[PDB]
Amino acid sequence: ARPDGADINSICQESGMLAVRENRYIVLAKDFEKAYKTVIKKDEQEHEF
Amino acid sequence: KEQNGDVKEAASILQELQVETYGSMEKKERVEFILEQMRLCLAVKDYIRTQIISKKINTKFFQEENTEKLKLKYYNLMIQLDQHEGSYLSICKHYRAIYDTPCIQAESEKWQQALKSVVLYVILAPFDNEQSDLVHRISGDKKLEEIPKYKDLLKLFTTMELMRWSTLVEDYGMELRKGSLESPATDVFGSTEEGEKRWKDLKNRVVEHNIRIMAKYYTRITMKRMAQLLDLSVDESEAFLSNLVVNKTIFAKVDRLAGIINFQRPKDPNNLLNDWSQKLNSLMSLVNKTTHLIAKEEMIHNLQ
Amino acid sequence: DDPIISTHLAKLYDNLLEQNLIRVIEPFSRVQIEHISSLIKLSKADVERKLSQM
């Protein structure tokens, strides 16, 4: 329910391969955030008007 | 070491295992430490706990020769992962890693347990080409043929030596009666929950490899005389038939409609193919006969 | 709370029949119909007509 299929591919890219930068399997809920900050977040989060 | 550790300190060291391996760009202490809890997880006495920490171990490899002999220090534990309870066959280099240490040395008894471990383990291992081929690939040792037991079991690699099982029990129970290198015996039959289990899987060996070797004269063989020529009882042979036949790695055909049935090959249900091979190839051999008959008879007639 | 008691575990054990029939007949083609069904523990109760149907 948070507006942050094509991105999910890069989502897992970022999150998983940074856990592999961390070099472990277990994927965290923070890994979502790691995949939700390097994205199309230009102008967060409402045209305000 | 406060209490020499416990499940609490096991959880401690484990939680401190997989966190720092990358905050600590470490090649040796990380190796000598990811093993440090191998006891705290084997003193835990849980096969799958050791296997989880080994799933951790897989991360670190090319461990060979960290120092000149750091692996002669770690491989004891690496094989200790599945040393006395592990799979009888996945010990290929596991139950091999024991030979090199006193092969690096010039030991006599420690090298003898090294040898009679690098060999007396595959008889536990199920049948395979690897075991069979390798145990004679590794043949050529000089310290190994100095053991009547090694010679005895190495001879077993042909005709199965369908021997009175108690005779082999002598040959490999007097290992514990060695006024010489005996650590072979303790590695083999100084053990109880696996050494006696080694005797059991040795019964498995004799019966199943005899099934292998005796596959020639079959298509006529009785359940009773099976046991008679098996060095084991009939209902013992019943259970052996049962396990080898539900394993069914070979295709026999048996029934107690008579009990005279055998660990057979497909029992020859085939058409002319048999006749075809026979007639054709035999007749061909006969034309070959003729064609060299002329030749060699002429040769022996050369002087005349 | 079983919706139907005519099919649920009925079909399970139905499948299991031949699933247990490929363990007593898995070893060899020919066999005594008794000890082959000593595993199913009934040598002639229902093994007979079941395997016939099969």
From Swiss-Prot, chain A:
Localization of this protein: Cytoplasm; Nucleus
Residue numbers bearing the N6-acetyllysine modification: K30, K34
Coiled-coil residues: none
Family of this protein: Belongs to the AAA ATPase family.
Oligomer and partners: Component of the 19S proteasome regulatory particle complex. The 26S proteasome consists of a 20S core particle (CP) and two 19S regulatory subunits (RP). The regulatory particle is made of a lid composed of 9 subunits, a base containing 6 ATPases including PSMC4 and few additional components. Interacts with NR1I3. Interacts with PAAF1. Interacts with TRIM5. Interacts with ZFAND1.
Function statement: Component of the 26S proteasome, a multiprotein complex involved in the ATP-dependent degradation of ubiquitinated proteins. This complex plays a key role in the maintenance of protein homeostasis by removing misfolded or damaged proteins, which could impair cellular functions, and by removing proteins whose functions are no longer required. Therefore, the proteasome participates in numerous cellular processes, including cell cycle progression, apoptosis, or DNA damage repair.
Name of this chain's protein: 26S proteasome regulatory subunit 6B
Organism encoding this protein: Homo sapiens (Human)
From Swiss-Prot, chain B:
Residue stretches making up the PCI domain: 90-268
Keyword Acetylation among UniProt keywords: yes
UniProt entry keywords in alphabetical sequence: Acetylation, Intellectual disability, Isopeptide bond, Proteasome, Ubl conjugation
Keyword set includes Glycoprotein: no
Positions bearing N6-acetyllysine: K69, K216
Coiled coil: none
GO CC terms in record: cytoplasm; cytosol; extracellular exosome; extracellular region; ficolin-1-rich granule lumen; membrane; nucleoplasm; proteasome accessory complex
Top-rank lineage group of the source organism: Eukaryota
Membrane-spanning parts: none
Recorded family membership: Belongs to the proteasome subunit p55 family.
Summary of subunit composition and partner proteins: Component of the 19S proteasome regulatory particle complex. The 26S proteasome consists of a 20S core particle (CP) and two 19S regulatory subunits (RP). The regulatory particle is made of a lid composed of 9 subunits including PSMD12, a base containing 6 ATPases and few additional components. Interacts with ERCC6.
Disease link: Stankiewicz-Isidor syndrome: A neurodevelopmental disorder characterized by delayed psychomotor development, intellectual disability, behavioral disorders, mild dysmorphism, ophthalmologic anomalies, feeding difficulties, deafness, and variable congenital malformations of the cardiac and/or urogenital systems.
Function, in words: Component of the 26S proteasome, a multiprotein complex involved in the ATP-dependent degradation of ubiquitinated proteins. This complex plays a key role in the maintenance of protein homeostasis by removing misfolded or damaged proteins, which could impair cellular functions, and by removing proteins whose functions are no longer required. Therefore, the proteasome participates in numerous cellular processes, including cell cycle progression, apoptosis, or DNA damage repair.
Protein name in UniProt: 26S proteasome non-ATPase regulatory subunit 12
Organism: Homo sapiens
Gene field: PSMD12
Whole-protein coverage range: 153 to 456 of 456
Curated annotation (Swiss-Prot), chain C:
Tissue-specificity statement: Highly expressed in embryonic stem cells (ESCs). Expression decreases as ESCs differentiate.
Localisation per UniProt entry: Nucleus; Cytoplasm, Cytosol
Changes after translation: Phosphorylated by AMPK.
Induction (free text): By FOXO4; expression in embryonic stem cells (ESCs) is mediated by FOXO4.
Family (UniProt): Belongs to the proteasome subunit S9 family.
Biological role stated in the UniProt entry: Component of the 26S proteasome, a multiprotein complex involved in the ATP-dependent degradation of ubiquitinated proteins. This complex plays a key role in the maintenance of protein homeostasis by removing misfolded or damaged proteins, which could impair cellular functions, and by removing proteins whose functions are no longer required. Therefore, the proteasome participates in numerous cellular processes, including cell cycle progression, apoptosis, or DNA damage repair. In the complex, PSMD11 is required for proteasome assembly.
Known partners and oligomeric status: Component of the 19S proteasome regulatory particle complex. The 26S proteasome consists of a 20S core particle (CP) and two 19S regulatory subunits (RP). The regulatory particle is made of a lid composed of 9 subunits including PSMD11, a base containing 6 ATPases and few additional components.
Name of this chain's protein: 26S proteasome non-ATPase regulatory subunit 11
Portion held of the full protein: 315 to 368 of 422
